[PDB]
């Protein structure tokens, strides 16, 4: 089941997401899966300014860059601190350890954290090419937490923030598509013309690894919050 809520713009969609989030908490949600990127930024702002209280709750993020500490300003840990956790801390917030000595031990660890704390509500965006998290076209639907080689476009974009070419992460530790699908409820937010092709492929195309988001067709409880421009093809 995929319900679609069509909204005017990102501001409106973010407010709908907030109301839905509050309701899930009121009805007992305890573990949240969180998103990075620009998609959830207005949602996070609304949460920071709200009366929500995450003190008895757990959060789990999808990804961290290999080679970055949680204190590094380019890390997803730091992004989450700035945008959410400084204002609204959780009982515990998990992200992969980018500094892990053994990346295979770290991927196994993260899978076990997901088993220990199954996610009640996952907030998600969609990529222009229908990627989900760091899972690009071709990713197996069976994938659990895994090491991802960043796309060259991503590396080029991120390079602008480092010394220091040797310092630019080339990999991430990322929740896989099977990992993400385990959430009891998924809220996918998509805004702008740039997302329209991906949204149409997700909703109307075949289920195929060429379109990572297409696996969401098979999830029992996905709600799509899409503005008019992102929803143009559905």
Swiss-Prot record:
Entry-linked HAMAP family: GlcN6P_deamin (MF_01241)
Residues at the active site: 63, 129, 131, 136
Biochemical pathway: Amino-sugar metabolism; N-acetylneuraminate degradation; D-fructose 6-phosphate from N-acetylneuraminate: step 5/5
Biological processes annotated in GO: amino sugar metabolic process; carbohydrate metabolic process; glucosamine catabolic process; N-acetylglucosamine catabolic process; N-acetylneuraminate catabolic process
Annotated S-S bridges: none
Pfam families for the chain: Glucosamine_iso
Name of this chain's protein: Glucosamine-6-phosphate deaminase
Native species: Streptococcus mutans serotype c (strain ATCC 700610 / UA159)
Lineage of source species: Bacteria, Bacillati, Bacillota, Bacilli, Lactobacillales
């Amino acid at each position: 089941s995929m319900k679609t809520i069509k909204v005017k713009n990102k501001t409106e969609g973010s407010k709908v997401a907030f109301r839905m989030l509050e309701e899930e908490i009121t009805f007992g949600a305890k573990t949240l899966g969180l998103a990075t990127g620009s998609t959830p930024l207005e949602l996070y702002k609304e949460i920071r300014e709200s009366h929500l209280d995450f003190s008895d709750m757990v959060s789990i993020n999808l990804d961290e860059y290999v080679g970055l500490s949680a204190d590094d300003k380019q890390s997803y840990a730091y992004f989450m601190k700035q945008n959410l956790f400084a204002a609204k801390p959780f009982k515990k917030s998990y992200l992969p350890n980018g500094l892990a000595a053994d990346l295979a031990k770290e991927t196994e660890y993260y899978d076990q954290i997901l088993a220990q704390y199954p996610i009640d509500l996952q907030i998600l965006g969609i990529g222009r090419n229908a990627h989900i998290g760091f899972n690009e076209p071709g990713t197996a639907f069976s994938s659990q937490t895994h090491l991802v080689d960043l796309t060259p476009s991503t590396i080029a974009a991120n390079s602008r923030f480092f010394e220091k070419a040797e310092d630019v992460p080339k990999q991430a530790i990322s929740m896989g598509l099977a990992s993400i699908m385990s959430a009891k409820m998924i809220l996918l937010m998509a805004f702008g013309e740039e997302k329209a092709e991906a949204v149409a492929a997700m909703v109307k195309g075949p289920v195929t690894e060429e379109i990572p988001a297409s696996i969401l067709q098979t999830h029992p409880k996905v709600i799509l919050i899409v503005d008019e421009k992102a929803g143009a093809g559905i």
